[PDB]
């Protein structure tokens, strides 16, 4: 049940809501008021999802799919079988997510650490809200949201993309991808760096942070350091997801045409717009 | 917090001197106070050596060989060059020449030169990551991690073009052109979303962000107990390591150790291009259309 | 076919890999225990990994994990219920006792050494050639606690030499003794240094270091521990 050093940490307090009421654990897990909140939202949501599955007449997970209301319903409510169920399920997800974040906050307090983790998570939550709330509202129907199904959701991605041409040309999409790639690069390195120091060549002594900083200056002439790389990671990650939201929130709202075409602005600057030759002249 | 609120400087650190040939290391560079906020302010020194120079020279040759081609396309006009910079493209030889090294220069030869340059550039730099580690007596994690990346690149412009029978199947050097090639590569193989490696690869990419978010915010959350000093924490568990592990145990039911978390890390990132490489390799050599394959499984 | 082969293969690879990953993270704090310290009955599907031994630099010995676990300090906590899973209430002063968000681990009572075998962290006064290169130099600024009362004055900065970083502020108290304050728990302002976790009256309780030019892993933990704990336990004294 407890890690060899856990007991002295399991003291009362830190709860945001409800005092000592839910201030307790279940196996390794911490409950807290929000422990309960998330459970309830999670229970409800899964139920509704199964209920959608009978109306659909399949129990096969590769097939199950809960779709939003069709565009004709705009931002109004829709019949269960006709889009209501997704709308509730979406409400329930949100409930789950936010609650899961606030529990993280409550654990943070009991342990006496910073709130960076709940913090970073809120970016994930905000990306999800962008795709099922902010964008549809702004566009004008729940129908612009993505459906909850394993492959159907990949389909929405593909269809929504190809609507504006090759989505690769969405400029904030370019930026968002550069982080995803960069972050992975940096996670690759960080991990590798620490391990190689902690697990040197056979029979040698554990290296030191000094060796870590040296290994990299030797390699590329600079080392961001231990505090740095952790600051870096958090940032690349949060940024990747920040730009991911951005590229979507603008798509279909302030730009509805082909993304490639938006680049004509550059190429049509009057100082070289008419100069012959090249690719565009 | 996230940024330093006070900077401290001392004599330029010339670093540990294991078996390193000190004759090759450079001189210390300036110090960016700018940089000093996010992380270390000290620039340099850097280790040159034979492999560094070869790598660094081939590296520039590659880049320049592409550059002259762009200029030739731009009508040597600096205005066009700027206007059309992302539209220019150095394309592989036509399918006609196959795996031939005899394609005319304007028709694909120049692409081979550039690639040859990149090949040497990249491999030498790989050997560089290895040696730099050896000379400090360190594990070779970094070189092996690097090898994963190299895998996907090897497959894209070398192994797959060769197994298909022609260089024309490789990726063109160009900003918009390599985007198009990607988009088109999926169309031709029946939508890469049905390539289960592609799907796996995305999971590990998404995951890398998830994890580096988790790890980073955690270490910052406990740097008030010297969390970032991970090597000593491994060697002698501090409350930092404890609060870290527990926050996570109490949230989701299990947890890492300080050495442990970094194994999760190196593997989550390395699996991105590992799986990736495989998904692409089978694409068009063994499987012509992932949707059809998806219907049968064979 | 081949593809089918490859993917089935991979899902198998991946499964033994997780298994590996998982057992490696079982190198500390395992095996599990009951609230009374007796070994717990259900330790999960995963076995303990086979031990690994780390050779610590500067002849500081070896470390073998997993290995015999022991807190090596008293815990002043008492159960608040008759069944498992409820909090344990401090039986004294959690701060003074070092439980809760004020917990510290019995790390070695030796300082962290740099790559050369010299003390990693030093008061700047004794760090030849170090200076505040940017930002507000705290040194000389009064220190304010969450109760908005002055508690002392910064009389130095303890820097991390190899990473060239400010780790702690040393503070001079009203009785002429000094304490270290983690850099990460104070806001350096233009005319003062503000500490939100501790009220002026608790600065004296901050554990002291035995030698004036060195800190040990044990003392770092006892200090960081203490200051962090203020956040929850000084709470009645904190106003804003
Ligand atoms: C086709 C694909 C080919 C494409 C090429 C791309 C290859 C890229 C691979 C990169 C691997 C990154 C790994 C990072 C790492 O640990 O590196 C350090 C690690 C140790 O570095 P060191 O400096 O030598 O030692 C320092 C310390 O002494 C020791 O330090 P240490 O303790 O940190 O190292 C110990 C480490 C040792 O690490 C290794 O030994 C690496 C293993 C490499 C595996 C390669 C993956 C191939 C993917 C296959 C997918 C199948 C599809 C077909 O332990 C592990 O990580 C164990 C891995 C566990 C694997 C689980 C296997 C399960 C098998 C199935 C069992 C049944 C399940 C039940 C159901 O490096 C290696 O061991 C080198 C591996 C190189 C092999 C490359 C393949 C050649 C082709
Ligand atoms: C954000 C970008 C796009 C999108 C584009 C893609 C693309 C492109 C792909 C996926 C893939 C996946 N997507 Mg998606 N996906 C989106 C939004 C979502 C949402 C959401 C609520 O917002 C979720 C939960 C998922 C979940 C998933 C997984 C089924 C799968 C692997 C992801 C992964 O490894 O992440 C990293 C996270 C982890 C490793 C942590 C653990 C995650 C586990 C696997 C979560 C599974 C949840 C799932 C089974 C449903 C549970 C819900 C109920 C409680 C039952 N996507 C939006 C619309 N998604 C890949 C796939 O192969 O699936 C077809 C793929 O190729
Ligand atoms: C229309 C587009 C198609 C499609 C077609 C492809 C194709 C084609 C490929 C990918 C690939 C990938 N796709 Mg896909 N993909 C689509 C939609 C998506 C979506 C989505 C819809 O949300 C996502 C999230 C992804 C995500 C991804 C990545 C997981 C994956 C590449 C990983 C990587 O980091 O390589 C980045 C890393 C590298 C390329 C390694 C290179 C390392 C070298 C050595 C670097 C050298 C630098 C050089 C020498 C210059 C030096 C630098 C200078 C000094 C500055 N795809 C659709 C279906 N996708 C790749 C893959 O693996 O697929 C299975 C791939 O080949
Ligand atoms: C495991 C997967 C991820 C990964 C890992 C990875 N990559 C790695 C490593 C590892 C573990 C290394 O050790 C190695 C490295 O040394 O990094 C520091 C590398 C590396 N990955 C790199 C790039 C890279 N990795 C990528 C991807 C990934 N790498 C994956 C996501 C990508 C993409 C496309 O996503 C890129 C672009 C290099 C930084 C470095 C390998 C360097 C190399 O091989 O150099 C060879 C040649 C040269 C010396 C060329 C230099 C020519 C330049 C001077 C021209 C450009 C001039 C330009 C205009 C300059 C200005 C830039 C401004 C920003 C200031
Ligand atoms: C912001 C950067 C990245 C990030 C960070 C991040 N994620 C995080 C955190 C952080 C910092 C956490 O602390 C938290 C965590 O605890 O991790 C272990 C979390 C987490 N990220 C998760 C998943 C996740 N994160 C993702 C993405 C990312 N997370 C980013 C790329 C993704 C994808 C698709 O990329 C996924 C799948 C969880 C493992 C975990 C949060 C767990 C949680 O919220 O539990 C509460 C909810 C439930 C128990 C289930 C609720 C059931 C619903 C009511 C119904 C189901 C509806 C759903 C909409 C159906 C979708 C079906 C699909 C097929 C489309
Ligand atoms: C111990 O040493 C060290 C480590 O440890 C092992 C390391 O890991 C590393 C390795 C780390 C790295 C190389 C990381 C370096 C990071 C980068 C180069 C940055 C990565 C990110 C990018 C390339 C993306 C750049 C994007 C930018 C600047 C965009 C900025 C914002 C905007 C333009 C505004 C957005 C608005 C838009 C588009 C509006 C759109 C409007 C309409 C459509 C209308 C190093 C060096 C190290 O030293
Ligand atoms: C250095 O330090 C660090 C650590 O350790 C010292 C750490 O561990 C970690 C954490 C990281 C790891 C252990 C590595 C592995 C992690 C991942 C690959 C992330 C992906 C995670 C998952 C797939 C797990 C997702 C699981 C969740 C959200 C919980 C599972 C939960 C349930 C089945 C039940 C959910 C709970 C409910 C309903 C409420 C509570 C319960 C009641 C009954 C009420 C990090 C980041 C770290 O930086
Ligand atoms: C300012 O102007 C001057 C001229 C000074 C410049 O220098 C400007 C230069 C620029 C304009 C340069 C611009 C360069 C880019 C736009 C480059 C973009 C490159 C990419 C987007 C590349 C993407 C993908 C590349 C891939 C996957 C390459 C793979 C290569 C290989 C695996 C190598 C394979 C080897 C070959 C085929 C030959 C092997 C032969 C043997 C004998 C072994
Ligand atoms: C966090 C809330 C998320 C809700 C997701 C969608 C719910 C749609 C609410 C509309 C209900 C009725 N209406 C049209 C009268 O407003
Ligand atoms: C590092 C361990 C975590 C790995 C995450 C494994 C779950 C990913 C599930 C992806 C679903 C994939 N597939 C093959 C059907 O496309
Ligand atoms: C993917 C999530 C995995 C979480 C693993 C959690 C381990 C819990 C150990 C069993 C505890 C049991 N319980 C709840 C019945 O008391
Ligand atoms: C895709 C990520 C999945 C994470 C893998 C799940 C590992 C669960 C380990 C549970 C450990 C149980 N224990 C011993 C803590 O009780
Ligand atoms: Fe780390």
List of long-range contacts for B59-64, beta carbons under 8 Å, 24+ apart: B59/B117, B59/B121, B59/B125, B61/B117, B61/B121, B62/B114, B62/B115, B62/B117, B62/B118, B62/B121
The chain B residue lying nearest C220, using CA atoms, is B225
User: DSSP string covering A26-83, please?
Assistant: ETTEE--HHHHHHHHHHHHHHHHHHHHHHHHT---TTT--B----GGGTTS---GGGT
Best probe of the A interface among B18, B208, B229, B239, by most A CBs < 10 A, is: B208
Ligand 5: atom nearest CA of A41 is 54
Strands C193-195 and C142-145: parallel
- The rounded Å distance from CA A134 to ligand 1 centre is 44
SS3 A180: helix
How far apart are alpha carbons B245 and B261 in whole angstroms? 10
Taking CA atoms, A79 is separated from A46, C147, C210, in Å, by: 19, 57, 73
Nearest to C166 by CA among C135, C197, C208: C135
**Angular region, A111: left φ>0, alpha ψ -120 to 50, beta rest:** alpha
Q: What is the CA radius of gyration of chain A?
A: 25
Write the residue in C54, C88, C105 that is nearest to A10 by C-beta: C88
Residues in chain A: 281
Angle between helices B196-221 and A116-129 in degrees, nearest 10 = 140
SS3 A268: coil
Strands A25-26 and C193-195: unpaired
- Could you give phi then psi for residue C5, rounded to 5 degrees? -65, -55
- The rounded Å distance from CA A187 to ligand 12 centre is 21
How far apart are alpha carbons C80 and C91 in whole angstroms? 11
A253 CA: distance to closest CA in chain C (Å): 40
C30 CA: distance to closest CA in chain B (Å): 11
Exp. method: X-ray
How far apart are alpha carbons B256 and C183 in whole angstroms? 26
Contacts of A23 in chain C (CB under 8 A): 87
Q: Atom 11 in ligand 9: which residue has the minimum CA distance?
A: A77
Taking CA atoms, C171 is separated from A191, B43, B224, C157, C176, in Å, by: 37, 32, 17, 9, 10
| A22 in Cβ contact with A35 (< 8 Å) | yes
Taking CA atoms, C68 is separated from A88, B119, C28, C51, in Å, by: 52, 51, 10, 11
Pocket of ligand 11 contains residue A26 by CB under 6 Å:
yes
Planar angle of CA B39, B40, B41, nearest 5 degrees:
115
User: DSSP string covering chain C, please?
Assistant: -HHHHHHHHHHHHHHHHHHHHHHHTTSSS-S-B-TTSSBPS---SPPPPPPEEEE-TTT--EEEES------S---EEESSSSTT--EEESS-HHHHT-GGG------SSPPB-TTSSBSEEEGGGSTT-EEEEE---TT-EEEETTS-EEEEEEEEEEETTTTEEEEEEEEETTS-EEEEEGGG-EE-SS-EEESSS-GGGGGGSPPPSSTT---HHHHHHHHHHHHHHHHHTGGG---
Best probe of the A interface among B213, B218, B232, B240, by most A CBs < 10 A, is: B213
Q: Atom 27 in ligand 6: which residue has the minimum CA distance?
A: A175
Number of Cα atoms under 13 Å in the Cβ half of residue B23: 3
Nearest to B59 by CA among B51, B69, B70: B51
Nearest to C229 by CA among A118, B224, B226: B224
Resolution in Å, one decimal, please: 3.1
Q: Enumerate the CATH 1.20.85.10 domain ranges in chain A, comma separated.
A: 1-163, 164-263
- Could you give phi then psi for residue C80, rounded to 5 degrees? -115, -5
* CATH fold group of domain A1-163: Photosynthetic Reaction Center, subunit M; domain 1 (1.20.85)
**A196 and B142 in contact by Cβ < 8 A?**
yes
Nearest to B229 by CA among B203, B201, B258, B256: B258
Outline where A112-167 has alpha helix (H): 116-129, 135-139, 152-162
Taking CA atoms, A40 is separated from A99, A177, B96, B244, B251, in Å, by: 10, 36, 64, 27, 17
What ranges make up the beta strands (E) of A134-213? none
- Could you give phi then psi for residue C234, rounded to 5 degrees? -85, -15
SS3 A217: helix
Q: How many CB atoms lie within 10 A of CB A71?
A: 13
Give the domains, in start order, of chain C with CATH numbers. Answer: 2-106 (4.10.540.10), 107-239 (3.90.50.10)
Write the residue in A113, A188, A195 that is nearest to B263 by C-beta: A195
User: DSSP string covering B134-180, please?
Assistant: HTTT--SHHHHHHHHHHHHHHIIIIIHHHHHT-GGGS--BSHHHHHH
**Residues whose beta carbon lies within 6 Å of some atom of ligand 8:** B 63-64, 66-68, 70-71, 112, 115-116, 118-119, 153-154, 156-158, 171, 173-175, 178
Planar angle of CA A108, C234, A7, nearest 5 degrees:
50
Tokens for C32? 């599990």
How far apart are alpha carbons C92 and C100 in whole angstroms? 12
SS3 B42: strand
The residue to which tokens 């199950």 are assigned: A64
**A8 and C35 in contact by Cβ < 8 A?**
no
Tokens for C107? 């790390």
Nearest to C72 by CA among C34, C104, C100, C95: C104
Strands A29-30 and A25-26: antiparallel
How far apart are alpha carbons C170 and C162 in whole angstroms? 19
C80 CA: distance to closest CA in chain A (Å): 9
C106–B contact, CB cutoff 8 A = no
How far apart are alpha carbons C100 and B238 in whole angstroms? 15
| A192 in Cβ contact with B259 (< 8 Å) | no
Q: How many CB atoms lie within 10 A of CB A47?
A: 12
Pocket of ligand 11 contains residue A114 by CB under 6 Å:
no
How far apart are alpha carbons C162 and C174 in whole angstroms? 33
Residues in chain B: 298
End-to-end CA distance of chain A: 72
Contacts of A135 (CB under 8 A, 6+ apart): A144, A145, A248, A249, A251, A252, A253
| B92 in Cβ contact with B148 (< 8 Å) | no
Tokens for A112? 């006496």
Contacts of C18 (CB under 8 A, 6+ apart): none
Nearest to A275 by CA among B132, B82, C179: B82
Sequence ranges of the binding site of B for (7R,8Z)-bacteriochlorophyll b: 178, 198
| B243 in Cβ contact with B224 (< 8 Å) | no
Contacts of A238 (CB under 8 A, 6+ apart): A120, A123, B213
**Angular region, A67: left φ>0, alpha ψ -120 to 50, beta rest:** beta
How far apart are alpha carbons C153 and C173 in whole angstroms? 7
B288–C contact, CB cutoff 8 A = no
Was domain A164-263 assigned CATH 1.20.85.10? yes
How far apart are alpha carbons C182 and C159 in whole angstroms? 11
Q: Counting Cβ atoms within 10 Å, is residue C129 exposed (0-12), middle (13-18) or buried (19+)?
A: exposed
Ligand 2: atom nearest CA of A156 is 58
- The rounded Å distance from CA B264 to ligand 13 centre is 11
Ligand 12: atom nearest CA of B207 is 1
Nearest to C165 by CA among A228, A232, B233: A228
Tokens for A175? 């930026």
Q: Counting Cβ atoms within 10 Å, is residue A57 exposed (0-12), middle (13-18) or buried (19+)?
A: exposed
Give the domains, in start order, of chain B with CATH numbers. Answer: 1-139 (1.20.85.10), 140-298 (1.20.85.10)
C184–B contact, CB cutoff 8 A = yes
**A2 and C69 in contact by Cβ < 8 A?**
no
| A117 in Cβ contact with A76 (< 8 Å) | no
Which residues are C157's β-sheet partners? C169
């Amino acid at each position: 049940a407890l890690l060899s050093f856990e007991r002295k940490y399991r003291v009362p307090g830190g709860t945001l809501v409800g005092g000592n009421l839910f201030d307790f654990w279940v196996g390794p897990f911490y409950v807290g008021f929000f422990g309960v909140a998330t459970f309830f939202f999670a229970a409800l949501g899964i139920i509704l999802i199964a209920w959608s599955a009978v109306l659909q007449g399949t129990w096969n997970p590769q097939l199950i799919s809960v779709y939003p209301p069709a565009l004709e319903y705009g931002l109004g409510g829709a019949p269960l079988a006709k889009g209501g169920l997704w709308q509730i399920i979406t409400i329930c997800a949100t409930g789950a997510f936010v609650s899961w974040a606030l529990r993280e906050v409550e654990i943070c307090r009991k342990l006496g650490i910073g709130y960076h983790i709940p913090f970073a998570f809120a970016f994930a939550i905000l990306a999800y809200l962008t795709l099922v709330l902010f964008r549809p509202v702004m566009m004008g129907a729940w129908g612009y949201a993505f459906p909850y199904g394993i492959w159907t959701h990949l389909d929405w991605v593909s269809n929504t993309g190809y609507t504006y041409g090759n989505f690769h040309y969405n400029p904030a999409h370019m930026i968002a991808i550069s982080f995803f790639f960069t972050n992975a690069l940096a996670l690759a390195l960080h991990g590798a760096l620490v391990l190689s120091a902690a697990n040197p060549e056979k029979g040698k002594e554990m290296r030191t942070p000094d060796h870590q900083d040296t290994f990299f200056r030797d390699l590329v002439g600079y080392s961001i350091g231990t505090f740095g790389i952790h600051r870096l990671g958090l940032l690349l990650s949060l940024s990747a997801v920040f730009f991911s939201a951005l590229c979507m929130i603008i798509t279909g709202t302030i730009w509805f045409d082909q993304w490639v075409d938006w680049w004509q602005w550059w190429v049509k600057l009057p100082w070289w717009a008419n100069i012959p030759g090249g690719i565009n002249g | 917090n996230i940024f330093s609120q006070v900077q401290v400087r001392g004599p330029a650190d010339l670093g540990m001197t294991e078996d390193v040939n000190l004759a090759n290391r450079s001189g210390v560079g300036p110090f960016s106070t700018l940089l000093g906020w996010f992380g270390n302010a000290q620039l340099g020194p850097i280790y040159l050596g034979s492999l560094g120079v070869l790598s660094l020279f081939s590296g520039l040759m590659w880049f320049f060989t592409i550059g002259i081609w762009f200029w030739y396309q731009a009508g040597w006009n600096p205005a066009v060059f700027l206007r059309d910079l992302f539209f220019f493209s150095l394309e592989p030889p036509a399918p006609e020449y196959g795996l031939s090294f005899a394609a005319p220069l304007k028709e694909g030869g120049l692409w081979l030169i550039a690639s040859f340059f990149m090949f040497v550039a990249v491999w030498s730099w790989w050997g560089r990551t290895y040696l730099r580690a050896q000379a400090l007596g360190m594990g070779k994690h970094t070189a092996w991690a690097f090898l994963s990346a190299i895998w996907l690149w090897m497959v894209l412009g070398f192994i797959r073009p060769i197994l298909m029978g022609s260089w024309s199947e490789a990726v063109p050097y160009g900003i918009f052109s390599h985007l198009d090639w990607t988009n088109n590569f999926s169309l031709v193989h029946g939508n890469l979303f049905y390539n289960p490696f592609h799907g796996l690869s995305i999971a590990f990419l998404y995951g890398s962000a998830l994890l580096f978010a988790m790890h980073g915010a955690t270490i910052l959350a406990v740097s008030r107990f010297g969390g970032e000093r991970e090597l000593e924490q491994i060697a002698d568990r501090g409350t930092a390591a404890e609060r870290a592990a527990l926050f996570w145990r109490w949230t989701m039911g299990f947890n890492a150790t300080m050495e442990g978390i970094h194994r999760w890390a190196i593997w989550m990132a390395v699996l991105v291009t590992l799986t990736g490489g495989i998904g692409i390799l089978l694409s068009g050599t063994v499987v012509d259309n992932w949707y059809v394959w998806g219907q049968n499984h064979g | 076919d081949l593809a089918s082969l490859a993917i089935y293969s991979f899902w198998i690879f991946l499964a033994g890999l997780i298994y590996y990953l998982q057992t490696e993270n079982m190198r500390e704090g395992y095996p599990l225990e009951n609230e009374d310290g007796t070994p717990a009955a259900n330790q999960g599907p995963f076995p303990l990994p086979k031990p690994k031994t780390f050779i610590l630099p500067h002849g500081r010995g070896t470390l073998t994990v997993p290995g015999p676990e022991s807190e090596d300090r008293p815990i002043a906590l008492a159960r608040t219920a008759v069944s498992e899973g409820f909090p344990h209430a401090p039986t004294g002063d959690p701060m003074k006792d070092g439980v809760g968000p004020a917990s510290w681990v019995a790390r070695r009572d030796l300082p962290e050494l740099d790559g050369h075998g010299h003390n990693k962290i030093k008061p700047m006064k004794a760090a030849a050639g170090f200076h505040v290169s940017a930002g507000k130099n705290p040194i000389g600024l009064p220190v304010r606690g969450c109760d908005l009362e002055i508690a002392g004055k910064v009389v130095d900065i303890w820097v991390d030499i190899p990473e060239q970083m400010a780790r702690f502020l040393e503070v001079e108290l009203k009785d002429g003794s000094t304490r270290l304050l983690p850099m990460q728990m104070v806001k350096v302002q233009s005319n003062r240094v503000h500490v939100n976790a501790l009220s002026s009256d608790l600065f004296a309780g901050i554990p002291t270091i035995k030698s004036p030019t060195e800190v040990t892993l044990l003392e770092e933990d006892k200090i960081c521990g203490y200051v962090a704990g203020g956040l929850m336990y000084a709470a009645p004294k904190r106003k804003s």
